[PDB]
Structure formats: structure tokens, C-alpha cells
């Protein structure tokens, strides 16, 4: 294959809403070594997040049934084994993505827009693993998601403006990491609230192509805020 055609096929799979196809294409483009476009970036995000997000939604439904089933041994042993199958599928999706990021995507990220973007993606996909991890392995998966977020966060506070969609995306997702993975609502809301207000302080710096994407995130910042304080 060749890169210009794989992004065309993956772009076709997306309209056909067959996201496993679209993801296999964008893994093949990535495994070619060269750093990806700002269009090739979005496609590989959209692919795997649709791929993984399906396993995430199934997992929460099956895990909530497995908890509501206490007392019927044969119905609960049956829900447990399916959850493990579903989550094993989830684990392999996340390890698929985090191996692309350590061997191809992060090391060849030239600029700071990409370095922040791909390290927020690392934090996300470790958080997806933390959402499900148990045993004694949670502790290690969680801090590695936080060390990805915090590195990307520092570059963003330094190298990007408070309205850049990728810096408000990192605030929104990190703020959610603090709330739903670290049970720290106060860092979580202080972080989202500051990201929101520093971005309104400077609406002079919105661009003609990004003001739609930046105002959308600012709205989800204050919804995570409004949800979290009620």
C-alpha cells in the first residue's frame, strides 16, 4: 500500500461507519514511520476512539449487571466471564494504541501542538485501562496516565494559548482524570474552572477555523463543572 490511498480508504470506512476498517488503515499509515498530517491525526483518533469507546460502553453495561446479580451464582459467574472477554478485547485495543505512540507517534512528534496532542492521547488510553484495571496493577496504570497528562499539560501552559483547542482538550480530559480516576473533585474543578476562565479572558485569540472547536470544549468544561458541583 501507499499513504495517500490508505487515508482515502480509511476516510471511506469512516463514512461507512466501519471503524475497525478505518483503524486498521490508520495503523498501517502510522507503521510507515513518517509523522502524520493534521488530517491524518484526526482520522486515527476518530477510528480507535470509536473502536475502544464501543468496548467501554459494553463493559459498563455488563459490569453493572454483574454487580446487580448478587445471590444467583450461575447468573453471576456467567456475567463475570463475559466482562473479562469484553475487557480483554479492551485491553488489547489500548495496548495497540499505546505501542503506536511509544514507537512511532510520540518520538516523531516534531512540534509542540503534536507533542501535547499525542501525550494527552497517551494519558487517555491509560485512563481507559485504569477505568477497568483491578488486582494490584491499577496503581501503576494510573500514575502512568497522570505522568502523560502532566507532561503534556506543562508544555501546553508554556507553549500554547488558553484558547487553543488542543490545550482546552487537555484541560477537559485531565480535569476528568482527577474526578473519575483520582477522586479529587477539588483539583478537578479548579483545573477546569481555570482553563475555562483563562480562555474567556482572551477571546481575541480565536482563529477562523478553530473558534467552533474551541467554544465547544469550553462548554463541556463548564458542564463538567456544573455536573460536579451539584
Amino acid at each position: 500500500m501507499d499513504k495517500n490511498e490508505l487515508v482515502q480508504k480509511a476516510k471511506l470506512a469512516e463514512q461507512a461507519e466501519r471503524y475497525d476498517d478505518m483503524a486498521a488503515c490508520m495503523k498501517s499509515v502510522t507503521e510507515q514511520g513518517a509523522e502524520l498530517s493534521n488530517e491524518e491525526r484526526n482520522l486515527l483518533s476518530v477510528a480507535y476512539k470509536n473502536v475502544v469507546g464501543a468496548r467501554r460502553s459494553s463493559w459498563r453495561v455488563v459490569s453493572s449487571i454483574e454487580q446487580k446479580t448478587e445471590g444467583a451464582e450461575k447468573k453471576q459467574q456467567m456475567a463475570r466471564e463475559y466482562r473479562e472477554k469484553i475487557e480483554t478485547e479492551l485491553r488489547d485495543i489500548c495496548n495497540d494504541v499505546l505501542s503506536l505512540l511509544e514507537k512511532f507517534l510520540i518520538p516523531n512528534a516534531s512540534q509542540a501542538e503534536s507533542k501535547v496532542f499525542y501525550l494527552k492521547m497517551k494519558g487517555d488510553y491509560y485512563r481507559y485501562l485504569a477505568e477497568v484495571a483491578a488486582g494490584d496493577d491499577k496503581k501503576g496504570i494510573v500514575d502512568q496516565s497522570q505522568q502523560a497528562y502532566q507532561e503534556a499539560f506543562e508544555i501546553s501552559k508554556k507553549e500554547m494559548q488558553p484558547t487553543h483547542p488542543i490545550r482546552l482538550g487537555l484541560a477537559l480530559n485531565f480535569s476528568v482524570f482527577y474526578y473519575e480516576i483520582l477522586n479529587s473533585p477539588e483539583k478537578a474543578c479548579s483545573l477546569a474552572k481555570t482553563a475555562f476562565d483563562e480562555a474567556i479572558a482572551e477571546l481575541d485569540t480565536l482563529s477562523e477555523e478553530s473558534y467552533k472547536d474551541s467554544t465547544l470544549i469550553m462548554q463541556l468544561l463548564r458542564d463538567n463543572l456544573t455536573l460536579w458541583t451539584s
Binding site: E39, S45, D124, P165, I166, N173, D213, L220, D223, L227
Partner: peptide, 10 residues
């Protein structure tokens, strides 16, 4: 209603 999250979408 859950915690909401993104991936910029450029």
C-alpha cells in the same frame, strides 16, 4: 449523566 471528554477534532 457522566464526566464528558474529547479529542479536539481539528
Amino acid at each position: 449523566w457522566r464526566s464528558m471528554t474529547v479529542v479536539p477534532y481539528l
